[PDB]
Every structure is written in structure tokens, then in C-alpha cells.
Amino acid sequence: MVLLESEQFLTELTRLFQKCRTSGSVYITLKKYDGRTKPIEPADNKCLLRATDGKKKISTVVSSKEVNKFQMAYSNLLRANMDGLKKR
RNA sequence: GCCGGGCGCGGUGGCGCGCGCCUGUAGUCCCAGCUACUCGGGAGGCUGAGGCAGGAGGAUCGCUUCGCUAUGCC
């Protein structure tokens, strides 16, 4: 798939959230990433996040050296783009 | 040989396909065409892949529920 870095991944996730506003759903999947590139070397410090809407899909890999920078930005992006609920 | 799958709607005689919904792998991009006919063509990555039968777990399709008694010639 379209594998991008965190900087472009967040921007494209923003576009997905905006495009799935009036019609469409946003699918976000998080899973521990081993690092394999060939069918069954195995790394234990990677995580994989895939964002799709049915038509366009993007994927990203976050490691230890970038977890600290990516966590806050991802949480802020979710807070900004996941509005539209009841406030009780 | 493999590189998503399924549900409903729609088009086509048919394939490819468009829309909405749900759900995966470490593992896809582009161009719209093939012309009575079961995946049209191009460019990339992989060695294991395909089919059958059971089991638990998601969104959905079809069914549903007249007696008692009280103050008293104090």
C-alpha cells in the first residue's frame, strides 16, 4: 500500500476525516508490527497504523525513536477531527 | 501461482465495474476496455498458493415475540 511517514500520514488522515464527514466512515487499525517484508530479522520495536475509508488507504510504521513525537500529534489530530458528538 | 474479501443497491446479454456498509495481511499502482466471450490491457513486488468440510467470535439479510353500635328519667 501507500506507505508514508508520520508527517504525511497525519495530513492524509485529516483529509480522510474531512472527506468522511457527510457520507463515509473512517477505519483506523493499530497492530504490533514485526517488520517482515517477505512471506513466512523480526523486530520487536515497531507498530503499524493503517487508515482507510474504503477507497484510499495509507499505512505508517512508528518506532521507538519517533513514538514520543508521534503520540501527542496523533492524539491532537484525533481530538481535532473526531468532533460531532453529544456533550451531555 | 499470489498481491484483499464479503453484504445490499445499480449498469452490462456477460466480464471489468460505480455507490453505500462491514471486515483483513508483513505483502499493489495505472489506463479504461474485452466484443457474443467467465478476469480487458499495461507497470511493479513475492514463493508458496488454490479448493473442500467443521468451530468461536463483527456490521448486515429474512422471521419474530334490616342487623352492629353510642350519650341517658346522674
From Swiss-Prot:
Coiled-coil stretches noted in the UniProt entry, renumbered to this chain: none
GO biological process, one term: protein targeting to ER
Alphabetical UniProt keywords: Cytoplasm, Phosphoprotein, Ribonucleoprotein, RNA-binding, Signal recognition particle
GO MF, one annotated term: RNA binding
Superkingdom assignment: Eukaryota
Cysteine disulfide partners in this protein: none
Residues recorded as bearing Phosphotyrosine in the entry: 27
Annotated function: Component of the signal recognition particle (SRP) complex, a ribonucleoprotein complex that mediates the cotranslational targeting of secretory and membrane proteins to the endoplasmic reticulum (ER). SRP9 together with SRP14 and the Alu portion of the SRP RNA, constitutes the elongation arrest domain of SRP. The complex of SRP9 and SRP14 is required for SRP RNA binding.
Similarity section: Belongs to the SRP14 family.
Quaternary organization: Heterodimer with SRP9; binds RNA as heterodimer. Component of a signal recognition particle (SRP) complex that consists of a 7SL RNA molecule of 300 nucleotides and six protein subunits: SRP72, SRP68, SRP54, SRP19, SRP14 and SRP9.
Descriptive protein name: Signal recognition particle 14 kDa protein
Source organism of the structure: Homo sapiens (Human)
Lineage: Eukaryota, Metazoa, Chordata, Craniata, Vertebrata
Gene name tied to this protein: SRP14
